[PDB]
Structure 1
Amino acid sequence: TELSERGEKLPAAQRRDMMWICRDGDRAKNHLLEANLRLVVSLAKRYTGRGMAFLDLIQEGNLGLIRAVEKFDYTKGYKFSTYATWWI
């Protein structure tokens, strides 16, 4: 995005693997969200029975899981559920 405007006609290999990494990041993000959907379901099974329906609670948990996978850090050496339970 920086080198698109006012930038450079990059080499073909550099632009091609730049697009490869740009696709791989979104593939990994979709893979991580689809991995932890089950954790969202297992947490949201207990807030039912009052007011809201079950599937709306599942969807709001999914949105919180989106925020948790956006703000998750790996260098703190903790597991992902430890951080994601707060946001969910």
Structure 2
Amino acid sequence: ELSERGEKLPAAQRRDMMWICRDGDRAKNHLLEANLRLVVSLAKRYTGRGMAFLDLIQEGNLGLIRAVEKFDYTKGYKFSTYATWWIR
């Protein structure tokens, strides 16, 4: 929203701004790769009726991505209790 209409060159400030932008996505990817086992453990109980196993796991992956989008830390709860709703 700033570079849409305004141009500035602080070199160190722009470098650390891009550093924040990169490492936020690094953090998000690390969180998803941490909770993949939760996704698999939830999806292992729906097998045998209708769909395959890995389709269920990838749908749980989409639900986990949405839960990471919707997560809030100010209420102060364990992440798995919030993410189980979106995965299911």
Q: Deviations over 1:27-63 (max 9, x none)?
A: 0000000000000000000011101000000000000
Partner Cα distance (1:38, 1:31) in 2? 13
SS across alignment from 2:32: helix
Partner Cα distance (1:54, 1:6) in 2? 49
Partner Cα distance (2:34, 2:6) in 1? 37
Partner Cα distance (2:33, 2:46) in 1? 22
Q: Deviations over 1:6-41 (max 9, x none)?
A: 113130011000000000100000000000000000
Partner Cα distance (1:79, 1:14) in 2? 35
Structure 1 runs (4+) greater than 4 angstroms displaced: none
Partner Cα distance (1:18, 1:28) in 2? 15
TM-score (norm 2): 0.96
Work out the percentage of aligned pairs sharing the same amino acid: 100
**Residues paired across the two proteins, number:** 87
